[PDB]
Each structure stands twice: as C-alpha cells, then as structure tokens.
Amino acid sequence: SMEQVAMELRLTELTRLLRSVLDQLQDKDPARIFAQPVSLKEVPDYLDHIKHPMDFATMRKRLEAQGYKNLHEFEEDFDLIIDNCMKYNARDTVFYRAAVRLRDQGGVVLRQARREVDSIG
C-alpha cells in the first residue's frame, strides 16, 4: 500500500536523524570506553552482574536494520550503556567517570533530538 510506503519513509527519516544523534553521542566518548560490548572472555562474570549489556556498536547494528521505531527506544539503549557502567564500576574509576560525562553531555543532544522528532513528526 501507499500508506505502508509513507510509514516506511517516516522510519527511514527517523533512522537518518538517529544516525546523526548516535554520531554526536559517540563523540562524547573519545576514549572509546563504550564503543564495543564488554568482552565475556575478559570479564567472565559480567552477565551475573548486568542483565542487558549494551554498547554503541550493538546500537548501530539495530539502527541500520531500522530497528528503532521511535526516539524512546533509542534512548532506552543509550541509558543502558550508562546505567550498566555505573553499576558494574565503582565511583572512583575511569569507567564510571566516563559514563557520567557521557550522560551529562549526551543530555544536550537528546533534548534537541526530541524537539526535532516532534517538530518533523
């Protein structure tokens, strides 16, 4: 149907905007701490601690399959990155601190993304 096509065009355009959001958030992680999944070879107990691991590469795979239906879904995954790190790692660690800085800096990007998603519909 033509309606299904219009809907697919909307999803494609959301995907475009979320790709730009993802790039901007990932620039706030210049150490690349959140770039890849935590390695279960190197942190073998990880899944005993963290039930839903997340990282920027996993988000990018989902994004490119157009697997985010709305901004809320994408924000859920970004918050997992931050929240998982702040639980597994202690306050005095470079990992925790990286997460805090990512959360604070990403807030700005996400605030305007929400306006844009609502604005363009």
Side-chain angles (χ1 to χ4, degrees), residues 101-110 112-119:
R101 290 164 60 84
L102 179 64
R103 191 200 56 188
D104 287 350
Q105 297 193 284
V108 180
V109 172
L110 289 169
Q112 201 53 39
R114 163 55 63 207
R115 293 191 66 84
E116 281 171 0
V117 168
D118 298 354
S119 197

Side-chain angles (χ1 to χ4, degrees), residues 18-30:
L18 293 184
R19 194 176 302 111
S20 171
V21 178
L22 182 65
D23 293 341
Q24 285 176 68
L25 293 174
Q26 187 153 29
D27 292 331
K28 311 312 173 149
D29 174 29

Side-chain angles (χ1 to χ4, degrees), residues 35-40 42-60 62-68 70-82:
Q36 292 292 333
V38 174
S39 175
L40 305 174
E42 303 171 356
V43 189
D45 72 358
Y46 189 67
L47 298 186
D48 292 343
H49 291 269
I50 297 304
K51 296 297 166 181
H52 294 100
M54 191 46 53
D55 66 273
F56 287 130
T58 300
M59 289 190 62
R60 196 175 293 282
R62 182 164 167 193
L63 179 62
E64 293 309 336
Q66 301 189 344
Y68 295 113
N70 54 55
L71 185 54
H72 180 72
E73 293 189 346
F74 177 98
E75 293 174 318
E76 284 195 330
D77 271 356
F78 177 65
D79 286 333
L80 277 177
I81 293 175
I82 297 314

